[PDB]
Symmetry: C3
């Protein structure tokens, strides 16, 4: 096996090209760069610039106005820990399809457009993962993809321990190479590409497809920023319990079918550590 992290054109995949290469990538590696998906550094620049201005120069009052009363990183501003501040180590801004907290109309306009482009690209590449593996989710493809996404931008003025994601797919845009993944048993660099987004397959891809997609571990070594988009299923997403057991899930589920809520519990869990 070549341990190269491949690149695919979303448009070419949607035209039915490279299907054998794509299927092999999904099973053996579970990560790839994606071009021709409506996301490049051009779309990132406006959003990145205005949130860094907010991190660096917004006042405490402005920040409090867009901070949730519980520090979950679901929506709005968060100072994130590893005299002073938890913001000394890192700062985050989070959003979803609704219940958002924006510091101004300008920010709102720019970040709503950026979110929509990310959400569209993530549903599109998940649709191709499903098609290439012959997978029809219980309840159908479009209701599975109309889901509960989370976007988080993180600024760092290990940075992240080794883990796998529990998403369907995760899309990463970035600004020494900090991001690393296991490929062919060795740590492999994942540098930025101005022309492409990085796609990690998550454990829900593995689950829905019956084990045809790998969910790879990755870590962040030690300024930098990243945009991380999690495509996450609805709580009522339903799957086969025996099939989950056949591809490595250590479930404690009675009965033949279960939901995402049954498996994970009452709160989303975005990442998991093997150790």
């Amino acid at each position: 096996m070549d341990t190269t992290v491949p690149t695919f054109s979303l448009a070419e995949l949607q035209q039915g090209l490279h299907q054998d290469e794509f299927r092999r990538c999904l099973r053996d590696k579970g990560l790839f760069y994606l071009t021709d998906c409506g996301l490049t550094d051009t779309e990132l620049k406006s959003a990145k610039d205005l949130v860094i201005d907010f991190f660096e120069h917004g006042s405490e009052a402005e920040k409090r106005a867009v901070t949730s009363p519980v520090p979950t990183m679901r929506r709005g501003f968060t100072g994130l820990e590893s005299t002073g501040s938890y913001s000394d180590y890192s700062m985050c801004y989070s959003m979803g399809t609704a219940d958002n907290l924006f510091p101004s109309g300008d920010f709102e306009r720019i970040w709503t457009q950026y979110f929509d482009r990310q959400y569209t690209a993530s549903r599109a590449v998940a649709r191709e993962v499903l098609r290439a593996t012959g997978t029809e989710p219980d309840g159908g493809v479009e209701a599975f993809l109309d889901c509960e996404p989370l976007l988080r931008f993180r600024y760092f003025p290990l940075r992240m321990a080794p883990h796998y994601d529990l998403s369907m797919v995760t899309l990463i845009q970035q600004t020494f190479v900090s991001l690393q993944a296991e490929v062919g048993g060795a740590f492999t660099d994942l540098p930025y590409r101005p022309d492409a987004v990085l796609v990690f397959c998550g454990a829900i891809a593995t689950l829905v497809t019956g084990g045809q997609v790998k969910a790879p571990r990755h870590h962040v070594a030690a300024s930098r920023t990243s945009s991380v988009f999690f495509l996450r299923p609805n709580a009522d997403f339903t799957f086969s319990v025996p099939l989950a057991r056949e591809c490595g899930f250590d479930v404690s589920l009675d009965g033949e079918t279960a939901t995402f809520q049954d498996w994970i519990g009452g709160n989303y869990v975005n990442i998991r550590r093997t150790s």
Copy 2:
């Protein structure tokens, strides 16, 4: 905003005074000192002295007689890890409303009285949090407050990573300032007050009130002792799922209402780390 940690008289709050100051404190800070609540260093001294005597001079046999067969820190004596002993780093004594383990009748009498005073003060200040925010829990106020409290005394012959509490409220009495909380975006000292208890609002205050109360992060830096009282809801405490989502809870709950058990699972979880 002034980043002063305020002090309120429980008696004055119950008389209907300072309601605007109290409401602003709950939303913007989520912590305060509480006087005139039946708890001062006078009530702490007997309980503190006899448990330290037990930690320092009780024998292994005496300690085993009040150690649970599973090391959960729910009831009785625990040596708590960060040749030797896990007790080398810290020692704990835990109790609740029933199923307690006491090393003697003297200890039992002193600690039952101390627990009752803490439980009374915690229900009283939670009642004022609910009243000041116009909150009627599903099932009513008194059945919500007749709940599942946990008292833990900890001796240290970071000491605790940054976290928020998942209680309704937490009451802390203490014996260089080790306890720190985020206030106005900066780490703020929380020293002892012989005349007052420190109150942290927890995530259940945020949840029941629909987001009108902040649950602040805090940490313990590096001998010292502390008494920590968690006022925790019953497993059947029921809330609105859409309202929880509107104030930052990243729930994975199908349907319009849920219970505390639905959210947290089958075991109490007292603290949560953002990271």
Copy 3:
């Protein structure tokens, strides 16, 4: 109390001997060595040798063929983290009663026989724990013991933080003493014995017996290998909620009975840290 870790003959226990010594060991210590159970270094040697050959000399392709697409350590090969590899720190091989991944017919034959001997010994010693404590599980003894075991072999070319196990029982065979447990309040060595297996009682022993069995904390200090066999209950294992509370379990369970799934959730959790 003597803080000696005792040794029992499985055959002698099954003949009804040493019942008072055995009961006292279970309540006060919750660990012991077990002889005369069909497990010695003779049965370990073939299995150990062929998996170390695989770790050291199998190629990446061979390893990928027996790696699950999600890195859960449930089945097959795993590189386990604390340029390079996560395999640099440790390597694991896992199996159960079905859905196994074997690198060859030789390996399969040797490891299926080894698993069967471990599973038999673990059910046998759990049967004696139940008998000695007068315990009839809901649904009966044999359906409780026909369960969901997990075998993991780990090679290390703290190694493990202090924890207790959430199994019924755990059986350990091993190849400076790395493994340590709390006994009588002090860290006590658990060296290998060519003629015996080490048995840890887990929290499910405590639960099913109503608090008559201790689940002791233990840790691994810092090459070495170990074989660790977890005897884990079925998801539908049912117990009394008030009795669980009386022996230290901090449950958040409405109602009078619950299942293992109700308590732990939708995924097995094998170990728990007090801290």
